[PDB]
Paper text:
Epstein-Bar virus (EBV), a member of the subfamily gammaherpesviruses that also includes the Kaposi Sarcoma-associated herpesvirus (KSHV),2,3 is the first identified oncovirus. Similar to other members of the family herpesviridae, EBV has a characteristic three-layer configuration: the outer lipid bilayer envelope containing viral glycoproteins responsible for host recognizing and membrane fusion, the inner pseudo-icosahedral nucleocapsid enclosing a 172-kb double-strand DNA (dsDNA) genome and the middle pleomorphic tegument compartment fulfilled with 20–40 different viral proteins. All herpesvirus capsid shell consists of 4 abundant proteins: the major capsid proteins (MCP) constituting the basic capsid skeleton through forming 150 hexons and 11 pentons, the small capsid proteins (SCP) binding to the tops of hexon MCPs or both hexon and penton MCPs, and the Tri1 and Tri2 forming the heterotrimeric triplexes to plug the large holes on the capsid floor. Once the viral dsDNA genome enters the procapsid shell through the portal that is located at a unique 5-fold vertex of the icosahedral capsid, the viral nucleocapsid is joined by the capsid-associated tegument complexes (CATCs).
We also determined the high-resolution structure of the CATC in portal-proximal penton vertices where the CATC binds exclusively to a specific one of the five registers. In order to do so, we performed focused 3D classification of the portal-proximal penton-vertex sub-particles (extracted from the C1 capsid) with a mask encompassing a region containing only one CATC. We finally obtained 93,334 (83.3%) CATC-binding portal-proximal penton vertex sub-particles. Through 3D refinement, we obtained reconstruction of the C1 CATC-binding portal-proximal penton vertex at 4.3 Å. The structure of CATC in the portal-proximal penton vertex is essentially identical to that in the portal vertex. Unlike its counterpart in KSHV that interacts with only one MCP,22 the head domain of BVRF1 simultaneously contacts two neighboring penton MCPs, mainly through the region of residues 291–314. As such, pORF64 (the BVRF1 homolog in KSHV) interacts with one penton MCP at the apex, whereas the head domain of EBV BVRF1 simultaneously contacts two neighboring MCPs at the middle of the MCP tower region. Each CATC binds both triplexes Ta and Tc. The interactions between the CATC and Ta are exclusively mediated by BGLF1. The interactions between the CATC and triplex Tc occur at the vertex-distal end of the CATC.
Author numbering:
A (entry chain g): 1 to 9, 13 to 50, 54 to 125, 131 to 301
B (entry chain W): 5 to 104, 113 to 337, 345 to 395
C (entry chain W): 1087 to 1149, 1179 to 1381
D (entry chain e): 9 to 71, 82 to 139, 150 to 238, 256 to 364
E (entry chain x): 199 to 395
F (entry chain f): 1 to 160, 172 to 301
G (entry chain S): 5 to 50
H (entry chain T): 1087 to 1135
Write the structure that this text describes.
């Protein structure tokens, strides 16, 4: 079937900087024939950065590996879950790929200037799944540990949070990360509200846990494990409050449920690509949408 | 150790392959060899396994008109039943009176029956089917592949033409009340009144009286001594006469007795043991053949019907007859015989008995159902 | 897949096909005694104390044709049980009710100010299965059989449910052709160890006149071995009613020979 | 605009979904054009290539139909780490090696995956009969004891689907496996291939419970963490993933309290009771016909799932 | 009888079948003693029971399309043969009244199946002989697309048995409804050798 | 590939039932088998959802994941035809559902047991004496809201705030939904597995994020923080007394993100539909099965 | 099992061989048989 | 992916093909003194202090 998407719009430096990236991907706005310039990847969502809406835009709209770049046109092919494709790891945070490892697509967290081409075009980060969850944990806890020492400098030390978050390690590839040493308080950064989601669900999890365990134990015995796993938590978080406004407790349970579901869908790494035969000689990878 | 010795005709080359043999045979130059010394070094006894012929059943296709169940049903090849959302029949029954006026307009509707099995073919004998064979082993493979595909497709249409008989046999059960009810209901001595309360209580008394005295008549006929033939005839005759055959297609000649102008007028569908017992209790039958149609009828849509069809649907059964419109029975006899005539009147191998003035046919389909491993 | 459609339509007005029974292959049911416990059918109900409930449940053995029990007083006439009648002690005839109504139907079925349909001279045989709130309907009528284990086929239920009787209060021709075209009157099984209820259509093949007629045919019951062994001996002059014992001739639609030693009876 | 009609005439007609046959005996050219699927292998001539239609773009067409062509995973393994007496259709497991550049991967049959669990502590007779020494396998995983100890063995082994091609090289074996798509053998007489899972490691889950019968009954592989070393079980089910983690928690309900009772999870990482992964779908009717696998000495029972559509998934943890 | 063996042999079918074995064993066995104390209707009873024995035999032999062993006087195929003892033979003659025929035609010599040159080569090398090598060659390498019908391969199922001369064979023939079976007692072949019949 | 399942009714059908069914053309219906023709029993969700007072929603989910799915296109007298939904094909699914949930552009649809009543989404077929009910098809976020509202009424049943929980609220309209009283052993088994998940969450949850949010409530006020009513919970006080360590936090987050993916898959009950290009003028969407 | 699944010039006879066959063969009247249902019901490759 | 199958089978009993070495071309290893070290071959082995 026909699969090309010809977007119409360059000069020699733009020709060069687009010809470097003839195997990378970018999302679109429509699965149609001809598109405008604005419908290309991540232009309208990354210019204040925020990870949750960028992930919603990356999972919502379709995806497209581009093939060729003319003086005025960009012939690109959208990817459909039917057949298979071929992609390359030509991204400024360079992570070496491997065979039959699931590939993910995350919005660019390592700086706008790293993954972009200024004519605008913003390409999303393509990098494998265990490195993806690893760097997601290591930027989440970096935001939390930077915000607590911007709050109280005696809680943690800046060098102590940097020997374990300034580097990731997968399969012996010991990479490094670009962390914003000056995030600036009150949000206003990338991953500024996802940590603000993580703390709220961590806060409201005991209030959910006591109400949920006490609510199920009078349902006498469906299994052992409603009362078997009462011994594994600490006894301090077991007997915490047990008296609160039922409307306020209801709103707290509902807020933690929606913030748990959105964060749980987000911690599922997104549109997962399944590669088959990566070759580091040619820097190519046979993949498909999964 | 992996080598036979049958009395082969050995080709006799002149190579010097005797040299340095048993020295090399002990070390293990060869993967597999069996030294034969003494008396054993001989052209051995010729022995063989015999394959005494392969066999298979020739699956006979059972046409719906090739059995006598088609005497029950007049058939028409209607090529567009997928586009038939409904079918109805009006009956204007003019009821006369008795000087010491009613017309009972009743509607009957058709009811479709969708049947489909599922044959299955591998992707091997399609990829080898579409390709062209070159070597004779691939031609011997391609012939087996096309025989597999043609046999599966012939099996599919065979299962369809058997499921047709199954649906006919089922819909002939769905409109079939049992015998002990219609023994009394067809007797007009009790529908004389208008079905008040006491005659209905009398009829449900007669149901119980006929249930334990008239059912299982073939089990009653063994203890009657010699009067088994007359008893079986006097039960089957009232079974026939209790069926009202006042159908509008009765007047046309669909099935005759294959010897004269005696129309059949009914068919008996029994099992194998019941057939083998009735063909001795009634003794010898009349004949072994029945004249009947060799194909279906035909009903296509002409443009005088097609403009109504593409206008708002609701086609007519005979638009030329409605374009013609007095009429009598002999006038409208081709209007009802809508293609059921002019068929070449082939004989059909099915048993036919004579019960008084009715030449009823009798046949058993277990031969058709037991080749499907299904419950009759 | 090979689709095929066919559309049939009747050409005559009245009935045009009869299905009789002709022979008996075998009585598959093994017509013997096999009661079903109400503990398996009503598991949620129990008594006051736990251990007395356990003693009852272990003593009756609470943990093949399914029998039932209709509880009757000992003054029920044996002349009633000789003739084939309805086992709930009332003549449950539906056509001496009027058609397509409820009031005279419930009057003939459950009201006892009018006498029996068969006998002019008494109300019922037992008042424990022929009343609106009796013992028989508190066992078997589906209005009080709620939250029961489905798939057990209490065979006495076919005499006691209301919607079957209100189905039988329709027109007679409507009744017989809806019996013929709709066999799904919640019947038994075909080839099982214990009789469940089938739910699939055009797979099993069975038809019931019990849901049509609401009577039953009495089997060869006897209150001693002596009446059996004298009914085997003489046949035209056996004793129906002895001093305190009784035997009941079979008026069943099937007729079994009773091979006792070498003394058959048919 | 008249060439447009020729282009659309080349583009319009799909393969016939319905065809009015009259008899099966005639075997018309129309129903042959229906039932024929273009092949995948032909002889090396212009006539055979043009007749099979291999050169057509995207999908095969002589000079889209609901069929997807498979993809093949190419793996290089040491000849000692694999047994060349393996069956064709057996699901393998690539272990992610911890070196930055390897060249040679490391795959495991579930027979070979058994002897990584056995040592340190029927099926096991055949497993020790096939591979003589576990130490030539227990160094492919370099730190097996630590990786089992901190319960990170599920994320380092990814499934790869069944094997199709195994050339019998002497030092470095190259095997081919279908990581996704219709599993079908690449042999010049195109013969079918049956996914074989050994019987004691394959416990059914439909009959373990004992009316709506679906078509695609999935096959789930399940790594669990036991006190007797981890185990690799295989589950066939006709249900959803949402159903499969609930019913697998219910199936492993004695084993979790077994592992809890013998060993207290003193740290935070010992809580995970392994994970599961969908290996793909197959037909629920003629699934899992039992057969046997004969070595030279013995024979173990082995299930034979026929016509498998391999589709791996990520690991969903059991707890 | 196909009535019981059509559902699929559950545990509630063999329980019926064993009881029916017992009920046929207590009643219908030794059918030449109940036919002695029957009285008048002995002929109908014996003629019923022999036909019940004949129709309960699976007559789906693959060589039944081959017309062999017809009756001499009529010309109808003799499908079936009774082998009885000599004392019951004259009893079965008198209970069935009289024989419908006195002799049957049949093959005068055995069918000749010797190995041909192609069969010998397949017997020498591989040690495997087929039945009809000419038919295998005719249905693989001479006309493979020409499929086989029951008329086109009735010569192939009859390996010379349909071309062998017909002599009469003396045996008592009776009539059971439509069929004809040959009732024969070869007890006289045994008693002059004193071997146990 | 031919996907056409004709379901022959075993009886006729009156004109009012025909006109009621003809309004529900294009709505998703489940089927018993996947074969060519079927009878009317097994069609719809009515065999598990009997004409009773007591529902059980999770058993209808276990039915829906087990059975196949089809779309209703042609209904006639005595027979109605259906078109199966097999994965791999792309379908046009119209929005013919009476509680009108507006559909997102390229969002994700989700099938559902009838939460807005038996009588609301049904057709009464007295002629074949059965009932065909129609499963609700609503978008995935509102489906998650309905599912969590059902579970929240299941846990709050031993406490009582009702109409604040027993009514869903969408921008088109807010709707009431039917609230049962007990889901039997299956809904309690779902709550058992979710109780395992929640209790193991409050075992392995990190403490530095609580130290963030405790000072952050004291620092900042937000719509993520207004539900605490400027009162830090006492569990934050009696857990944050310990110190902060980044190594155990990275050890905790490597099980947190491991368990949250499986918790996300503990809400994927009922099959999910991935849609694309929903037009709001024709109310149909080119959608395929996910 | 000694059954050979090879292709063959199968001679077609007309006798009703399948008279109560599946319930016979499932109970094992034959010493060695093979049931091929669906995709295995073809001729084998040479 | 082209494919081509060949089936070679010997028709002579004894050995039918020999292979001498004719001449050297180069000695790629220096025949020198660079012993391997057990610190690289047995790296886990260590001493007390």
């Amino acid at each position: 079937m026909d699969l090309k998407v010809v977007v119409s719009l360059l000069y020699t430096d733009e020709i060069a900087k687009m010809q470097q990236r003839i195997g990378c991907i970018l999302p679109l706005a429509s699965t149609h024939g001809t598109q405008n310039v604005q419908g290309l990847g991540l232009g309208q969502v990354y210019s204040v950065p925020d990870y949750v809406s960028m992930y919603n835009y990356l999972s919502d709209c379709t995806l497209a590996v581009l093939d060729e770049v003319s003086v005025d046109s960009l012939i690109l092919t959208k990817i459909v879950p039917g057949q298979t494709y071929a992609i390359k790891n030509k991204y400024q945070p360079f992570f070496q790929w491997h065979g039959t490892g699931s590939l993910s697509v995350m919005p660019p967290v390592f700086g706008r200037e790293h993954a972009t081409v200024k004519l605008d075009i913003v390409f999303p980060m393509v990098l494998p799944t265990p490195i993806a969850e690893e760097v997601l944990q290591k930027i989440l806890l970096f935001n939390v540990y930077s915000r607590v020492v911007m709050q109280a400098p005696g809680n943690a030390d800046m060098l102590d949070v940097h020997m374990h978050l300034g580097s990731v390690s997968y399969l012996g590839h010991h990479y490094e990360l670009a962390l914003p040493e000056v995030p600036g308080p009150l949000g206003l950064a990338l991953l500024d509200n996802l940590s603000l989601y993580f703390c709220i669900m961590v806060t409201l999890l005991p209030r959910a846990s006591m109400r949920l365990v006490r609510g199920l134990i009078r349902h006498e015995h469906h299994d052992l494990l409603n009362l078997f796993q009462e011994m594994v938590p600490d006894e301090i978080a077991r007997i915490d409050l047990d008296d609160l406004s039922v409307a306020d407790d209801l709103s707290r349970m509902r807020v933690m449920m929606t913030y748990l579901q959105s964060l749980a869908s987000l911690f599922n790494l997104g549109p997962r690509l399944a590669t088959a035969a990566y070759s580091q000689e040619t820097l190519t990878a046979t993949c498909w949408l999964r | 150790e992996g080598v036979e010795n049958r009395p082969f005709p050995y080709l006799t080359v002149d190579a010097d392959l005797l040299s340095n043999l048993r020295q090399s045979a002990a070390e293990g130059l060869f993967h597999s060899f069996d030294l034969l010394v003494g008396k054993d070094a001989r052209e051995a006894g010729i022995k063989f396994e015999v394959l005494l012929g392969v066999y298979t059943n020739a699956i006979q296709y059972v046409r719906f008109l090739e059995t006598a169940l088609a005497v029950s049903c007049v058939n028409t090849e209607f090529k567009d039943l997928s586009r038939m959302t409904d079918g109805k029949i009006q009956f204007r029954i003019s009821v006369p009176t008795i000087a010491h006026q009613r017309t009972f307009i009743v509607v009957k509707n058709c009811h479709k029956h969708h049947i489909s099995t599922e044959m299955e073919l591998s992707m091997l004998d399609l990829e080898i089917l579409h390709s062209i064979p070159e070597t004779p082993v691939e031609y011997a493979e391609y012939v087996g592949a096309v025989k597999t595909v043609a046999s599966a497709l012939q099996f599919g249409v065979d299962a369809l033409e058997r499921g047709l008989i199954n649906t006919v046999l089922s819909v002939k059960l769905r409109h079939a009340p049992p015998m002990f009810i219609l023994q009394t209901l067809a007797d007009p001595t009790f529908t004389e009144r208008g079905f008040s309360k006491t005659v209905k209580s009398d009829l449900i008394a007669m149901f119980k009286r006929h249930l334990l005295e008239h059912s299982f008549f073939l089990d009653r006929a063994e203890n009657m001594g010699s009067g088994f033939s007359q008893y079986v005839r006097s039960r089957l005759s009232e079974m026939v006469a209790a069926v009202s055959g006042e159908s509008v297609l009765k007047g046309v000649s669909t099935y005759t007795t294959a010897k004269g102008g005696e129309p059949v007028g009914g068919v008996f569908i029994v099992t194998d043991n019941v057939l083998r017992q009735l063909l001795t209790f009634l003794g010898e039958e009349a004949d072994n053949q029945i004249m009947g149609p060799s194909s279906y009828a035909s009903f296509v849509v002409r443009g005088e019907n097609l403009v109504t069809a593409v206008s708002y649907g609701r086609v007519m059964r005979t638009f030329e007859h409605f374009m013609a419109r007095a009429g009598s029975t002999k006038s409208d006899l081709p209007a009802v015989a809508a293609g059921v005539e002019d068929q070449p009147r082939v004989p059909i191998s099915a048993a036919v008995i004579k019960l008084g003035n009715h030449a009823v046919a009798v046949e058993s389909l277990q031969k058709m159902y037991n080749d499907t491993q299904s419950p009759y | 897949e090979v689709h095929h459609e066919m559309a049939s339509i009747d050409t005559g007005l009245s009935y045009s096909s009869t299905m009789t029974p002709a022979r008996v292959a075998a009585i598959t049911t093994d017509m013997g005694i096999h009661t079903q416990d109400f503990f398996s059918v009503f598991p949620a109900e129990a008594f006051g104390n736990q251990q007395v409930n356990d003693y009852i449940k272990a003593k009756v053995g609470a943990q093949q044709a399914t029998c039932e029990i209709i509880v009757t007083p000992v003054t029920a006439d044996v002349a009633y049980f000789q003739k084939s009648n309805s086992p709930r002690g009332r003549a449950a005839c539906v056509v001496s009710c009027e058609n397509y109504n409820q009031e005279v139907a419930e009057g003939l079925i459950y009201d006892h100010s009018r006498p029996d349909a068969a006998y002019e001279y008494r109300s019922t045989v037992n008042p424990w299965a022929s009343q609106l709130g009796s013992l028989g309907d508190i066992m078997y009528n589906s209005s009080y059989r709620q939250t029961a284990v489905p798939g057990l086929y209490s065979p006495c239920r076919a005499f006691f449910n209301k919607e079957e009787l209100l189905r039988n209060n329709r027109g007679l021709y409507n009744m017989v052709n809806e019996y013929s075209q709709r066999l799904g009157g919640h019947p038994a099984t075909s080839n099982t160890e214990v009789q469940f209820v089938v739910i699939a259509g055009t797979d099993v093949f069975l038809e019931q006149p019990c849901s049509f007629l609401q009577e039953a045919f009495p089997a060869l019951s006897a209150s001693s071995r002596a009446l059996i062994d004298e009914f085997m001996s003489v046949k035209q002059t056996h004793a129906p009613i002895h001093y305190g014992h009784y035997i009941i001739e079979e008026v069943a639609p099937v007729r079994r020979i009773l091979k006792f030693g070498n003394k058959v009876v048919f | 605009r008249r060439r447009l009609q020729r282009r659309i005439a080349g583009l319009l007609p799909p393969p016939a979904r319905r065809l009015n046959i009259s008899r099966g005996s005639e075997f018309t050219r129309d129903v042959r054009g229906l039932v024929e699927e273009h092949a995948q292998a032909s002889s090396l001539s212009a006539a055979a290539v043009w007749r099979a239609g291999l050169l057509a773009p995207g999908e095969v067409a002589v000079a889209w139909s609901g069929w997807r062509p498979p993809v093949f995973g190419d793996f290089l393994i040491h000849a000692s780490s694999f047994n060349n007496a393996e069956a064709t259709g057996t699901p393998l497991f690539q272990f992610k090696q911890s070196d930055p550049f390897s060249g040679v991967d490391a795959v495991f049959t579930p027979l070979s995956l058994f002897i990584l669990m056995n040592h340190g502590r029927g099926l096991t007779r055949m497993a020790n009969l096939l591979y003589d020494s576990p130490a030539t396998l227990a160094d492919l995983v370099p730190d097996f004891g630590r990786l089992v100890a901190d319960r990170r063995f599920h994320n380092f082994i990814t499934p790869v689907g069944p094997l199709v091609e195994n050339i019998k090289s002497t030092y470095l074996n190259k095997i081919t496996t279908v990581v996704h798509g219709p599993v079908v053998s690449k042999a010049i007489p195109r013969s079918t291939v049956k996914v074989t899972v050994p019987q004691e490691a394959f416990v059914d889950l439909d009959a373990w419970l004992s009316q709506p019968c679906p078509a695609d009954a999935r096959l789930y592989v399940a790594l669990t963490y036991e006190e007797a070393g981890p185990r690799f079980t295989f589950f066939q089910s006709s249900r959803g993933h949402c159903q499969i983690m609930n019913i697998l928690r219910i199936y492993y309900s004695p084993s979790i309290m077994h592992r809890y009772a013998v060993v207290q999870p003193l740290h935070i990482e010992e809580l995970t009771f392994g994970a599961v992964a969908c290996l793909g779908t197959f037909s629920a009717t003629d699934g899992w016909r039992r057969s046997a696998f004969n070595y030279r000495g013995s024979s173990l029972p082995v299930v034979e799932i026929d016509s498998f559509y391999s589709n791996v998934s990520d690991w969903e943890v059991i707890l | 009888d196909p009535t019981f063996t059509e559902r699929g042999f559950s545990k509630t079918v063999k329980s019926d079948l064993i009881a029916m074995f017992k009920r046929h064993l207590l009643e219908h066995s030794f059918f030449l003693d109940r036919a002695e104390n029957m009285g008048s209707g002995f002929s109908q009873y014996v003629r019923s029971r022999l036909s019940e024995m004949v129709a309960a035999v699976s007559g789906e032999s693959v060589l039944k399309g081959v017309s062999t062993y017809t009756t001499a006087k009529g010309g109808e195929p003799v499908g079936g043969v009774f082998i009885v003892t000599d004392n019951v033979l004259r009893q079965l003659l008198t209970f069935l009244g009289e024989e419908a025929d006195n002799q049957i035609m049949g093959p005068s010599s055995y069918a000749s199946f010797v190995v041909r040159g192609e069969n010998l080569v397949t017997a020498v090398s591989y040690g495997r002989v087929m039945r009809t090598f000419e038919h295998f060659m005719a249905r693989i390498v001479d006309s493979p697309e020409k499929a086989g019908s029951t008329k086109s391969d009735l010569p192939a199922v009859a390996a010379g048995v349909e071309d062998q001369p017909r002599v009469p064979i003396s045996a008592a023939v009776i009539k059971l409804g439509n069929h004809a079976v040959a009732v024969e007692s070869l007890q006289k072949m045994y008693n002059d050798t004193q071997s146990p019949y």
